[PDB]
Every structure is written in C-alpha cells, then in structure tokens.
What we know:
- It is classed as contractile protein.
- This is part of a larger assembly, with two copies of chain A, two copies of chain C, one copy of chain E and one copy of chain F.
- Chain A has 14 helices and 18 strands.
- By secondary structure, chain A is an alpha+beta fold.
- Chain A has three domains: 3-134 and 336-372, ATPase, nucleotide binding domain (Nucleotidyltransferase, domain 5), CATH 3.30.420.40; 135-176 and 270-335, ATPase, nucleotide binding domain (Nucleotidyltransferase, domain 5, 2-Layer Sandwich), CATH 3.30.420.40; 177-268, Actin, Chain A, domain 4, CATH 3.90.640.
- In chain A, α4 crosses α12, α5 (179-189) packs antiparallel against α8 (250-256) and α9 (271-280) crosses α11 (307-317).
- Chain A is flat and about 65 Å long.
- By secondary structure, chain C is low in regular secondary structure.
- The radius of gyration of chain C is 4 Å and the shape is flat.
- The longest helix of chain E has 16 residues, at 122-137.
- Classes of the chains: A alpha+beta, C little secondary structure, E mainly alpha, F alpha+beta.
- The A-F interface holds A 35, 37-44, 58-61, 199, 201-202, 205, 239-244 and F 140, 143, 146-147, 152, 169-176, 289-296, 325, 329-330, 333, 336, 339-340, 361, 364-365, 390.
- The complex binds adenosine-5'-diphosphate (3 copies) and magnesium ion (3 copies).
- Residues 10-13, 153-154, 179-180, 182-183, 207, 210-211, 298-300, 302-303, 333 of chain B line the site of one adenosine-5'-diphosphate.
Amino acid sequence: DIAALVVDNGSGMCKAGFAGDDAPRAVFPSIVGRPRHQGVMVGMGQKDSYVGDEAQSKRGILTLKYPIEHGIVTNWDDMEKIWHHTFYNELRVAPEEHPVLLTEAPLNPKANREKMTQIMFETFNTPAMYVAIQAVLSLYASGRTTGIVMDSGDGVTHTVPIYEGYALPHAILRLDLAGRDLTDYLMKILTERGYSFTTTAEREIVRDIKEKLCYVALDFEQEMATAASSSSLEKSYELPDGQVITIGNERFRCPEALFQPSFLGMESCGIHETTFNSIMKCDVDIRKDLYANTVLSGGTTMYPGIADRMQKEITALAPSTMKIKIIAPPERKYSVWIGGSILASLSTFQQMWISKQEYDESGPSIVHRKCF
Amino acid sequence: DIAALVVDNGSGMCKAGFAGDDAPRAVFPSIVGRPRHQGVMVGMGQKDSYVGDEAQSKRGILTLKYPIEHGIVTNWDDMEKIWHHTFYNELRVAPEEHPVLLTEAPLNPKANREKMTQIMFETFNTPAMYVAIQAVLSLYASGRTTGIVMDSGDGVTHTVPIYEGYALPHAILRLDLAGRDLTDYLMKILTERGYSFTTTAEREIVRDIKEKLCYVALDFEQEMATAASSSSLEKSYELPDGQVITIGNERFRCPEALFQPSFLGMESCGIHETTFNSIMKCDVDIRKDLYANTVLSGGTTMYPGIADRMQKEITALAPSTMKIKIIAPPERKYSVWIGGSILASLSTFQQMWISKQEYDESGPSIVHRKCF
Amino acid sequence: WXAXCPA
Amino acid sequence: WXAXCPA
Amino acid sequence: ARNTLSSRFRRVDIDEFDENKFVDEQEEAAAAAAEPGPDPSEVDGLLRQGDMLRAFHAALRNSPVNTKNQAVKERAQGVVLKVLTNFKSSEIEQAVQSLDRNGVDLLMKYIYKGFEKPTENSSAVLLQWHEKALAVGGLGSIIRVLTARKTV
Amino acid sequence: MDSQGRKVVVCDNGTGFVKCGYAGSNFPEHIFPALVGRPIIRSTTKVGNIEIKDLMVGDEASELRSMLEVNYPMENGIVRNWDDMKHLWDYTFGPEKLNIDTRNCKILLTEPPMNPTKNREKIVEVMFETYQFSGVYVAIQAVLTLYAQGLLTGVVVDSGDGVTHICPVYEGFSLPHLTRRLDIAGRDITRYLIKLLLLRGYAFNHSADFETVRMIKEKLCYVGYNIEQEQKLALETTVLVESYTLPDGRIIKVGGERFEAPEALFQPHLINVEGVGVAELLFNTIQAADIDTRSEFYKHIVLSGGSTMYPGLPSRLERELKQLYLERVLKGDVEKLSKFKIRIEDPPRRKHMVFLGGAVLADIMKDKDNFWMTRQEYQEKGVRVLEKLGVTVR
Ligand SMILES: Nc1ncnc2c1ncn2[C@@H]1O[C@H](COP(=O)(O)OP(=O)(O)O)[C@@H](O)[C@H]1O
Ligand SMILES: Nc1ncnc2c1ncn2[C@@H]1O[C@H](COP(=O)(O)OP(=O)(O)O)[C@@H](O)[C@H]1O
Ligand SMILES: Nc1ncnc2c1ncn2[C@@H]1O[C@H](COP(=O)(O)OP(=O)(O)O)[C@@H](O)[C@H]1O
Ligand SMILES: [Mg+2]
Ligand SMILES: [Mg+2]
Ligand SMILES: [Mg+2]
C-alpha cells in the first residue's frame, strides 16, 4: 500500500528503505563515476553517469566524485542523480506516492536543506517530506530518550546530548574529522612502507583496507612499543590484482587520529574530549545520566576496541564517582536509518510532515519553520 | 680543518661539492651504463660498467640505467657505484674525513633513508651524515624563511609550504611527474611526424631536444591555433649522425603535461593546481605570504614561459585581491645544492649531524628521529 | 614503489 | 618512418 | 649483441608445480595395510636344509607388489636375488617350468631388478635366468616388466 | 551492400599481406601477398612460355617470383613506395580480384597505432582523389580484433608481418597511453632466419629468395617452450633436423634454427633490438594499468596477426607470463601461483581477426551517414575530414 520512504543520504554511503523494516532496503556508496577515457567501441553502455555499486564495479576507468563532502552537498547535479537512482533503480518505486524522511548533520548551511526541500518538491514531486538530525534518529533508534548520541559518519562527527526528549542546542558539538580524513591519513602514512595510492579509484582500496584491518589501540604508546619490538602485530591484505601487502604499525596509527587530531595537523581536540566538552556544556543536574548512556553510531565507530578506549578516556576525564558506560550496539552502522524508519511509523510524526501546498504557500524556507 | 660534503643525488642528475661554495664542484648524470656487446680489444680500458659522464660519451654501445626512479633508489649496487664515483673520482676526497649532507624527496619510503644511512656509515665509513628535504634547502638558498617551494626535479615534483621557518608537514604535496615523464611523452608524440626514437641511448637525444627546443605556451588553446595556421613556430634539430628533424607543435605539447597530466594518462591535477591546493591546505592567516613568495626550483622548471603560465594559473585560481609573485631566478637549476651548502656551513648546524657513535648505538633506525 | 607505480 | 627506422 | 636486463625469471621451472600433472594413484587398502612380503627366516631355513625349488617358491610366495615402502621392497628383492643367484645352472629350467604365468611375470621383474646392483657373478646367473624365463614367457613378460607402475 | 546499392568493402592492407572482402562476410574473400614485381632476366633461370606482364602485382607476382624483382610497397606499417601501393590498390579493386566500381562504393581501411599522421592523411587523399570512393573509414586494429572475438575488454597482442603492437582496451574505453609498439615481426624473423641459414652455407640474397625463406619459416619454424630444454634437444639429439625442397630443386636442412629465428620475439637482443620480448612487454603494459583492471586484463589476452601462429606460441607466452607474475608480483610464493588465472584466447582463425572485426563493424555501420567520411566532406575540407574519426588534424 502507501508508506513513507526513508532515505538517510549520509556522506560516503547512501541508505534507503521503507518504514517498518529493520534494515535499509538499498545501501550503496554514494559516488558518481565519470569516464576519463574516450570510448571507441559500439555496444558499450552509459556515458557521463555511473552511480553506486555500478560505479564501484567499473572504477578502473572512471574518476569518482562524492557529491557530499563533510556533510555539505557540493554538487547538486550529482546529488540529483543519486536521488534519482535510489528512487527509480534501487528501491524501484515512484517517489510521488510516498513521504520521504531525509537526514542532515547539525550546524550546516541553511541553503543546503533549502535546496534539499526545493529539489524534493520540484523534481520528484513527493507529496510530503521531512528532514531530521541524524543524532535524534540514532537515539530514537536505540529506543532511549535520555542519552548523548556520538555519531561519526564519513564526513562529519557530532556529539548531541538529549535529556527527556528535549534537545539542547547550546551543547551540540560537531567535529569535522571523520572517516574520509582517516582514509586520507592512511593513504599518506602507507607511503612509509612504500605503498603509493593516489588515484580516487585506489582510495576505495585504501578505505576497504582500513575498515578491514585497522583497529584503534587501548594504550597507544604501549601498542607502538610492541609493534616496534615484534612482528606479531602485522596483517596481510590482498589487492585486487593479486598482490599481497603487509600493514603493521599503521593498523592503529590510522584510527588513533580520532583521539589526537594533531596527527593531521588539525590543531583541535579529539572526539573523546569533544564528548567531554559537550557534556560539560549541559546543566549540572543531568551530567550523570549522559555519562551513563553514551551511544555510538555510524560506520566510523566500528573499529575493534573503540568502546573501551572511549570509556577509558572519559573515565580519566570525568569525576571518579561518576560511572561511565559506552553503549555500543553492534548494529550501529545503520542505526540512524533504523531511527529514520522508526520516526516514520509514529502517528505523532504523521502531522509534522511538510505538505506540498505548505511548501507552495511559503516557499522553501518553511523547512526552517517546521523542521528543527 | 674539515669541511662537509654536499651531495644531492636526486633522480636524473647528481651534483656534489664542498660545503661553503657558490656552485657544485661536480655535476654529472646519475646513470650506470652496462656494455651490451662483447669487445675483444682487451687491455684498452675495458670495464664492466661506466658511471656518470663516462657513460654518456659511450652511450652508443651501452644500456643506460637510472638507479633512482621517482626519487626512490630501485638499485643499491648501482647507487653505491654512483656514490663511489662521486667520492673518489669527481670530488677526489676520502669520505672518512668529512661529513656528508644528502638530500631526499618528501613522502619516500623509510627504507630509502634507512639504507642511505646504512651505506654511508658501513661502506664509505663517514664520521657524520645528514639527510635533508630538498624543498627546504631550496628555500635556504633563496634567502628566505617564509614561502612555498615548488621543486620539480627530473623524476619527482613536490611542493612544501614553510612559514617563518615552521614547516607545515600536513600540506606537503608530492606528484610523481617530472622531466623523465615529459621526455617519455615527447618520445611518443614525436612519432606523429615520423621520428621513431626507442633506444635508451636515444632517450638522451630526446631529452636534449626537449631541454633545448621545448617551451611552455602561455595559452595552449591559442598556441595550438597559431602553430596550426602558420609555420612560424617550427624548429629544426640535428641528430648526432646527420639526419635533421623538425618539430613545430610538439614544442609546447611536451611541457603541457605538467599542467594537464591527463595527457600522460594520470588522474592527478597539474602543477599549478598542485601548488594552489598545497597553499589552501594551510591556515587562513599565512596564505597571503605563501602566495607572494612562490619559489621555483629544479631543472624541469627551466622552461621559457613557465613562470608566466604559473602566474596566469595561480592568479586565476587565487582570490582577486591576492598578489602572486613567482620567484624564479635563473640559478634555480641548482638551488637545492646551494641551500645544502648554506645549511652545512652554519655553526648552529654542527650539532645536528648524525655522529658515527650515534649510529653504532641504534643502527640505521636513527635517521628517522634526527633528520626532519 | 612496491604497490602503485613501479619504483 | 621519416626519422628513425626506414618506413 | 647481449642482454643487459634480468633474465632470471626463465630459470624458475613452474611446470614442476603444475596442478594438472599426472599423479600415480594407489589403493587405500594397499596404502593402509602393507604386506611384509616373503619371510626371510623361512627362506634361509629352506636354503640351509638344501631344497632349492621350495626355497624358490617361498621367495615368490608373496611380494610387496602393493605397498609403497622402500625398505620392505628392497628386503624382498634382496631375498629373491639371494635365492636366484644361488641355483645350479642346471636346475633353472626345472624351477622356471614350475611357475604359472604370473609367477614368470614376477620372476622377470625380480630379474630386471637384479641387474641394477650386480656383484662378481650375480649377473652371469641372472642372464641364464632371463634366458629361461624368456623362453617360457616371451616378450610379453618383458613388456609387463616395462609397463609396470610399482617396482619389485 | 547498403540500402543504396553501394558495396561496403573491407580492406586490411597489411605490410606482408592484403586481406580484402565485403562487409558481413565470415572469411576474407581474397588473401594475397602485398608485393609488386617487375620482370628481369637472370643467368640462372630460364623461362620462355608463361606470359609475364611489365607489372605483376599480388598473388601472381609471388607465384611467378622466380622471373621477377619484387618489392613490398609497405614496411613497418608505413608506406615507403606510393606508386607501388597505387598499383597494388589498382590490382585489388581490379577485375582479377574484388571487382567493384570505386565511384559507388564505401571502404573500410585499417592502420596500426602510433603511426605518422601524414601516412593516414595521404591514404585518405589517395582513396578520395584517385579512386574517388564515396565513403572511407579508418578504424583501429585492436578495436577490430575485439569486435571479431566478440569482447569489450582484453589486451590485443597483434603481431603482423611488419610490426607487433600491444593494445589494451577495458569495457570499451581505449587506453591510448598503454599502447605499446615493438618493431619486430614476421619480416625481422625472416631476416634473422636468413642470417642463420647463411651461417650454414645457403645464400638467399635476391628479392625472390625472401619469399622462399618466408615459406620456410612458415612451414618449419616454431617457438620453443622451455628454451633450455629446446637447446638441449638441439645440442644433444638430432630430432630437430628437417629437410625442405626449394623451388629450384635444392634440398636444405634446417635444425636448431627452427626455434632460434622465432625466438627473437621473446628475446629481441638476438637481432640487435634493445628492449623486452613480447611477453615482458605484455606484462609491463598490464602492470602499467590501474590496479582494478589488471585482473581482467590477465583473463582476456587476445592473440591476433599471422606471426602468432608459430606452433606453441600461446603456451610459451602463458609460461613466460606466469614466471614474470611469480617473480615480480607474488615475490616468489609458489603456493599462490596456482591461484593465478591466465586465459590466452587464441582462436583458430586468428590470422584474419582484423578483417573479421572490420566486417562486423561495417555490417553494423553501413547504413549511417555520420560514420563514414563522405567525398563531399573531403572536397569541402580536405584532409580535415579525418577529424570525424577522433584524430585531430588541420
Ligand atoms: N567496520 C568498520 N571499521 C572501520 N571503518 C568502517 C567500518 N565500516 C565502514 N567503515 C567506514 O565508514 C565510512 C563511511 O561509512 P558510514 O560512516 O556508515 O557512512 P555514513 O556517513 O553515510 O553513515 C567508510 O569510509 C568506511 O570505510
Ligand atoms: N632548461 C631546461 N628546460 C626544460 N627541461 C629541463 C631543463 N633542465 C632540466 N630539465 C628537465 O629536468 C630534469 C633535470 O632536473 P634536475 O634539477 O637535474 O633534477 P635533479 O635535481 O633531481 O637531478 C631533466 O630530466 C630534464 O628533462
Ligand atoms: N603460420 C605461420 N607461422 C609463422 N609465421 C607466419 C605464419 N603465417 C604467416 N607468418 C608471417 O607473418 C606474416 C603474415 O601475417 P599477417 O598478419 O598476414 O601480416 P600483415 O600484418 O601483413 O597482415 C607473413 O609475412 C609471415 O612472415
Ligand atoms: Mg552518517
Ligand atoms: Mg631537484
Ligand atoms: Mg594486420
């Protein structure tokens, strides 16, 4: 029958599905490929367009472009294609019969969501729509209503505390260090071994190596010492052609940047200090529950042994009597969307929808009035 | 009285001299020639391998091999021969009485420095040595402490931004694209006229054609129409056997690969965008000083028209109110060596050597802690 | 190089 | 060819 | 001219590492339960007693024609050679004519395996043995010796 | 033939052999050597009954070579003699060959890659001014080979009589920076065989004796597999000596030469060519491509050209590639070599792959008007009409 679609559209990987399911129906790396070589044969397929897994497959002759970068849609001529593909080619459903719940990171350009609403209501002709913060979705995906959502996608990382359903905007923290920055740092440090990756195609290989073999250390200096002393901490990966490379010390040097951004030259604070600061910006009467219900989410917090590291860090920073518990669900990689589908199955969210005529009567700015 | 030796050893050309001079004592191509015939006039000076200039004067009957490709030493037996010829035949000085200041490209594998140190301390038995980044000496020689160095050697092209003496290692960029790729691309585009150069002893003739005739066009899409309309742009060259070639259009299509690497089948951006991105990676405050102190260096930047085109590019790329000044002196073919001789002669440097005692205490793994 | 590019 | 090799 | 590039990649013989090469199968019962072949003590007892025909037949009673162990094969070969090279040159025809066709097809293998490690007069008698065994069994015996896949 | 009755001819114009026919055909209608001969007298030959015209071309100029001085109009894919080439083309479109009225026909021509542009420009000029064809297209040889095989990806190793070239193509997108061109082919192998035979006391110094040595190299010679084992066979045994009867009647004996003349493709330094063999050049071409295309390039190695018909060339190429891969990718791990999957596609009719691909492409694009270079466009622009193909010339 008639339901409400849910299109996360986070950076790196676009997720989409139908409300009610426990997993996004169509998830694909949100990229656009473009051929950098001139075709000569008749019979070859499309040109100037390759989206998702189709682009990932033929990346050997394409240049890849992420339309989203650090949470801000840089090129709309490609994001429109991404939406067209996830509507007509992956979910395989007309977008003029279903509400759509999009997601946006906190503290973003207003024109971003303005153009989002304008494109949703002007090209795909959806009946209604809604844009929500990813954190609120993540907490609404954990079934909790009191916690500090620590989300970390590929282009943004944000700590958002929420208490009794009330969101505190004064304490929302957003660090820009995220997954793709870790991928770049890995590409840079892999040169020490002698492995050069400089193509946007081989960036995918590096990203897969990262999310397959990289793990964040519990004690950085001790792990460095053990890696420098012995070879019992060296893993082997196999490139697509068939070569086998070895990564040792890099394995934990790559994710360690999340706690010491100075590795990237970014003179800022880590993600654990960001969590601690976003907590210390809340009222004094609620800091303990936030200390107790820290929830993680996103495809950049699945590194083995990250929950214990964050817990150690916060406990070192937080007072002794305060108890620290890092709620790390082993499904967080899609948690926000799960939250998305959840927020789409409540009779309380079936009236917060920005109607088509509501957009017509006031223009695209209505997103700021209705959506928070 | 002991004076350090400044020995560059970059790809394509090796330049050695004494510390405290205004010009390198001995410059010679860093090749090793293996005889590819079996000569029976025994006793007339036959050898197993000719190094440096002695190879060029015989390149007709030799296979010339470069031990350093893209800044990386791919053959260490040949590099030991290069260094022995530098020490005992070009400089004519025992290595065990002087410290040696070698240079290296940024973002090279750590095995390169490790083996450089191991060879300089276990084979040539030097009392002290050092390894410096080339683009830093290229700023030492320019008489500055703030600027962005754009060093384009024969085999590698890297950009290093420095401000007030504090280098920004998070903005050092590297591009494996230099004279050796321009010379192999000219060898390809010369076939359109009918000229077929294939032997490693004709790559030198093509490199000579390139370094004597080729120039960088200020406007490629206009100079193409110019060279298409009239024959007022052709130049003739005389091979060492009598035949004469003529090249009208190839002249600026050879160095145009620097600004459009897609000509060589490379995704990477040109040298102007490589410099601009490396500027915009720094902080907002120091970008104005980096703009107006853009230094050039290395042989590949010895093209008539390189500074004009670089300025026209980085000015159409930089904000409309920033002043761009391409610092390009005619002595930039050897700025790195002058910087090395300046650095090795300073008094405050005499504590930065790596002493033989230090190497005996920690092996070749020390060059990573001392050398920046 | 070992992986990527020759050197 | 014209320069290099015969053809 | 001469080659000034590395040609050491031609020395590696990848054909010995092939996966479609021929491997000689052997039966699982013949690989698990090995047959010890003849009993040497019985043979020395029958030789000391002085009966040549019965010692000969006891040498060919059972043979490691199914095992893969080199020690048992070498020992059985040694015992049967000890029996063969000790006959009188006259009683060879009578001993040969007392064997079935398989007996001759095995005696010829034990003969052709006695030429490979000869002594002062072992081959001078193995040649007479071969003469009689070929008179009885014909070239088919020599061919069943050549085209065998397990040597005794 | 298209919807206008204008025959669509396909002509390969190889350095060592012309293969011509019509579009959609499954086999070249005419395959004849591309050589032009002129009558001469020789003190050792006597013929007085076969009428020999003042200009023999093609097949008859090769079968009657004993009484002619023959010369090829092409060399290394570059037309050295334009008058002899015009005679060869007059004969090709003449009555005793493909019989067409060139005023009302389209033609599909070929050309090797990385070739001087004046060559193609002059060929198009000749086709539009002398024969006045109504349409001309000049396709790429590797593209035609992949058309004939029925693929969209693969690394065509096209080794003709005149020149060897390795061209990879991925998913239909041509990578022109990986096109390699080695100048050793049938003709240099024939010259090397002439040298080797001269070491034995036989002298083939005339223009006609070259075709005799060619026919010897085609019957007897073969590419070795384990060159150490082949040298052991040639030095220890005598099972490689084979006799051949020359046309005059002499009987020559060819031994180890059988595997030394065609070895100059894998070991060029035998004929004073400083480079790498066809196997090492193929491996370097592959390993110069992006990491994501190498694994598919290894599985679609398409052989083409006559010079790849030596008995045992696919297997030797595969063995060479496996050894290179074991030493320079797996760094010496024999366990992983069994996982390396090559597939050297050597079709049986691989001697005319370019013509079959041209036939397929012409059968596809005969009825279009934006594919062919029309004579009107030539009369209007000149040698600029070639810009239709994607080759920019002014
Ligand atoms: N198990 C994992 N460990 C480390 N990194 C991962 C893992 N899974 C995914 N990633 C990384 O997360 C990045 C993007 O995924 P994700 O953050 O889920 O996208 P989004 O920002 O839209 O949620 C990718 O670069 C990927 O490599
Ligand atoms: N005057 C010139 N014009 C054009 N190209 C040049 C010129 N001088 C040098 N080159 C190119 O740059 C390279 C020489 O640069 P060089 O400074 O010798 O490199 P390195 O310092 O690493 O030895 C050569 O390969 C050549 O192709
Ligand atoms: N079976 C064969 N074995 C070895 N060489 C051959 C064989 N057939 C032809 N050749 C060589 O290759 C040439 C023919 O190949 P072909 O592809 O027709 O050349 P072209 O490039 O002229 O089309 C002949 O000149 C001959 O020297
Ligand atoms: Mg996200
Ligand atoms: Mg330099
Ligand atoms: Mg051909």
